[PDB]
Enzyme design. Sequence first.
Site, PDB file in Angstrom:
ATOM      1  N   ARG A  56       0.823  -1.189   0.000  1.00  0.00           N
ATOM      2  CA  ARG A  56       0.000   0.000   0.000  1.00  0.00           C
ATOM      3  C   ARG A  56       0.866   1.252   0.000  1.00  0.00           C
ATOM      4  NH1 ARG A  56      -3.065  -3.118   3.815  1.00  0.00           N
ATOM      5  NH2 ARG A  56      -4.910  -3.843   2.686  1.00  0.00           N
ATOM      6  N   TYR A  72      -5.082   1.170 -12.294  1.00  0.00           N
ATOM      7  CA  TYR A  72      -5.006   0.383 -11.077  1.00  0.00           C
ATOM      8  C   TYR A  72      -4.011  -0.751 -11.156  1.00  0.00           C
ATOM      9  CZ  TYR A  72      -6.059  -2.470  -7.146  1.00  0.00           C
ATOM     10  OH  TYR A  72      -5.842  -3.131  -5.958  1.00  0.00           O
ATOM     11  N   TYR A  76       0.212  -1.331  -9.328  1.00  0.00           N
ATOM     12  CA  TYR A  76       0.800  -2.417  -8.538  1.00  0.00           C
ATOM     13  C   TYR A  76       1.963  -3.103  -9.236  1.00  0.00           C
ATOM     14  CZ  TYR A  76      -2.794  -1.220  -5.486  1.00  0.00           C
ATOM     15  OH  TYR A  76      -3.597  -0.497  -4.636  1.00  0.00           O
TER      16      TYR A  76
END
EC number: 4.2.1.84
Lengths: 211, 194
Positions: A56, A72, A76
């Site tokens: 995170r 999105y 990551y």
Amino acid sequence: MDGVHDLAGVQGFGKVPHTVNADIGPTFHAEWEHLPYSLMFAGVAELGAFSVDEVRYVVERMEPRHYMMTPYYERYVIGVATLMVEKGILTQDELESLAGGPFPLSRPSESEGRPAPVETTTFEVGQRVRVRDEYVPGHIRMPAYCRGRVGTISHRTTEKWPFPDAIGHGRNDAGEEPTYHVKFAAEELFGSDTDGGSVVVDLFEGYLEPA
Amino acid sequence: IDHPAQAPVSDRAWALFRALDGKGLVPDGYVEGWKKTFEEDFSPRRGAELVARAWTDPEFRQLLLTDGTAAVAQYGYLGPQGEYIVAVEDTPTLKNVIVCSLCSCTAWPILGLPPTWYKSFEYRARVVREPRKVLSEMGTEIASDIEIRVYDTTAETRYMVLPQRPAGTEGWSQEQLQEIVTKDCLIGVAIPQV
Ligand SMILES: [Fe+3]
Ligand SMILES: [Zn+2]
């Protein structure tokens, strides 16, 4: 960290791209999309290289315009790649050679994080609490809309977890704390500029104080 | 006088994988196995089963509302990102909606992986402040006198909404009732319909 990721309450965005019960299609719409969650679990669970909290935070460390323009699953990919490099498992060079191109990473951490508070208060359901009016430059699981605000505890977890502000920086003083579901009146949080009724935020014990 | 560049994402994504797997770091079949889980085991059909059971079993409904982890554990549907479950109940005067304004936190094993719209900046920014307007735009009209409560998933609790059982489902079996409980009913943005 008061970064661009803390979006709740920001104004100027248009429609949510969805009508209820529209067909969402497959879980993964592109062939690489399953890789970031898989490789994050390889790092957490197989290599023991970082915690989920560190994933995170490294996504929150993406430069603000780069965070805002990246979809999105790609945030990551950059996030997990940055932690492999920061942890000394990979180098940016070898990623760029294999990518045949630039692979910009998240920005270095500007904070070492903070330990879990040594002495804290156990609160009870129904008690009125205030979210500590405090500013933390490293990882924190407190959205800014509820900082300094007043609400009522509706739940105390029966379980305890390491403090995000310490484990999201890989520190060894994260302890463990329960979290609390703190219910806020919508007008406590956004005055008259809200059409909702109440908002419940799940806050670690260390973020709260009585009254 | 005083006067970002990136390779295509697919090339960066495959590069990250090939760099790890080369170094003996990714187990054989590991990534493929996760893809299967994410696709096949993490499913909103599990959340729909928990809702059809609560709707027909008052004692299970009370267990789901007091200790949601224990109620899901009875089915063995707990898992990564769905280890501490709290179910939140819709009533005639209260509509509950879930968001992770800071990222995407979702009860994976029972709702499935978050859809793209749930992860959008639009949903993350707007539903905590104007949930009645956001739901209206998505097609769900909530009367002015119903309270809307937004649960922002900021720590380890993972939420599922327990919507109201519609009128007209009298004598419906659990199989029939499961069918009207969609992924969007479990996030809280749709109301189950007959
Ligand atoms: Fe999230
Ligand atoms: Zn110039």
